[PDB]
Amino acid sequence: GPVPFSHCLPTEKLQRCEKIGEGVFGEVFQTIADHTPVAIKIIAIEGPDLVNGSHQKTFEEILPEIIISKELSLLSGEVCNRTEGFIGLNSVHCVQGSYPPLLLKAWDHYNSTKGSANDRPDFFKDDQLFIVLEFEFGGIDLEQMRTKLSSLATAKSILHQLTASLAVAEASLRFEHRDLHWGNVLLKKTSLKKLHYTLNGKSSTIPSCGLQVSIIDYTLSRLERDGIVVFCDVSMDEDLFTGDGDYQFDIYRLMKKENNNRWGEYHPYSNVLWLHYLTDKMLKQMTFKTKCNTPAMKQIKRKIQEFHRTMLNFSSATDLLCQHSLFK
Numbered sequence: 486g487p488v489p490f491s492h493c494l495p496t497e498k499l500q501r502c503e504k505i506g507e508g509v510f511g512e513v514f515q516t517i518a519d520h521t522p523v524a525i526k527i528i529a530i531e532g533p534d535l536v537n538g539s540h541q542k543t544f545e546e547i548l549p550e551i552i553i554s555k556e557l558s559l560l561s562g563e564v565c566n567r568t569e570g571f572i573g574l575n576s577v578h579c580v581q582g583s584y585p586p587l588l589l590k591a592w593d594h595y596n597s598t599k600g601s602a603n604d605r606p607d608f609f610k611d612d613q614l615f616i617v618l619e620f621e622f623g624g625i626d627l628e629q630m631r632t633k634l635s636s637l638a639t640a641k642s643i644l645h646q647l648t649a650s651l652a653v654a655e656a657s658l659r660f661e662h663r664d665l666h667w668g669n670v671l672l673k674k675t676s677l678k679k680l681h682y683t684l685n686g687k688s689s690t691i692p693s694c695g696l697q698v699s700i701i702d703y704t705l706s707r708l709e710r711d712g713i714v715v716f717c718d719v720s721m722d723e724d725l726f727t728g729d730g731d732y733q734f735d736i737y738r739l740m741k742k743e744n745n746n747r748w749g750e751y752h753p754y755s756n757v758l759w760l761h762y763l764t765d766k767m768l769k770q771m772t773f774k775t776k777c778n779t780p781a782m783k784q785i786k787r788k789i790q791e792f793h794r795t796m797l798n799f800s801s802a803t804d805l806l807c808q809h810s811l812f813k
């Protein structure tokens with residue numbers, strides 16, 4: 486059965502926790518495990534209390550995310566369809582306990598400095614269950630880097646890396662991310678000049694521009710293996726489709742239009758929609774340290790603009806990667 490919080494989060498680990506992220510699902514912390522940075526996602530399950538606007542999922546309802554996390558993690562070590570463009574999953578635990586005061590301290594700090602949309606997680610009782618997913622530390626999200634990238638050459642690398650990763654997952658797993666907002670794109674420095682992926686047995690390279698991209702957060706994701714589909718059924722969700730103020734919220738509606746509200750089906754066009762949303766963010770909501778005031782860099786900008794205006798005529802990330810001029 487479940488283990489105590491302290492099994493996953495002994496004092497030293499707890500003392501080094503800093504909150505790095507959140508969602509309706511719960512909370513994400515960074516800490517150190519065996520001298521190694523890790524990210525910990527903590528989800529309340531099986532309880533009756535409202536949490537961040539919603540009822541808690543059951544164990545059965547969080548199993549899809551766990552399975553998808555495992556499958557995408559495996560892609561870094563596969564051969565025919567291989568990418569490091571997701572995030573490694575180190576472990577999963579079911580924990581029982583009230584929320585550790587030291588996590589509440591980290592939570593408070595985050596609320597004080599960035600602000601939170603979540604309820605302070607201080608109302609859980611000592612019998613409360615949680616799922617704790619420990620992930621590889623993937624760096625910092627794209628939104629937080631919105632004024633820090635070197636140039637549009639960097640932006641182009643990011644788009645290429647994202648497209649290739651999604652293509653590899655499409656090919657291997659018929660994967661849709663379904664929620665690839667710019668908080669779910671991580672960037673981490675690398676000294677590698679070229680990154681490698683393999684799609685259906687063919688290996689290719691991408692110039693890194695000094696960054697490795699990781700796609701995270703599989704709460705809404707879908708995939709299948711051997712005819713068994715794993716997904717989040719949002720067909721009766723009202724609020725997911727009623728946001729405004731960001732193109733993000735249009736994507737939810739556009740996905741539902743694409744799939745006729747049948748979330749079990751495979752519609753890799755959803756990956757194209759998210760990549761469109763991300764291309765939009767780069768061109769409109771980001772600022773680079775080197776402006777594109779040289780001919781070479783201005784050509785890159787034009788290519789990203791041309792991508793933005795044509796990519797929605799492609800049927801999948803695989804179609805984009807294999808056929809779009811941006812990646813030739």
Ligand SMILES: Cn1cc(-c2ccn3ncc(-c4ccnc(CN)c4)c3n2)cn1
Pocket residue numbers: 505506507513524526572620621622623624625626668669671701702703
């Ligand atoms: C929901 N989820 C999140 C992760 C996950 C996994 C590994 N890392 N490594 C760094 C982050 C991170 C850093 C900064 N902002 C955010 C949130 N925008 C995340 C991270 N997040 C898994 N699932």
Ligand code: NA
Pocket residue numbers: 510511512527528529536606
């Ligand atoms: Na929570």
Ligand code: NA
Pocket residue numbers: 569570571572573623698699700
């Ligand atoms: Na990665």
Ligand code: NI
Pocket residue numbers: 578
């Ligand atoms: Ni254990």
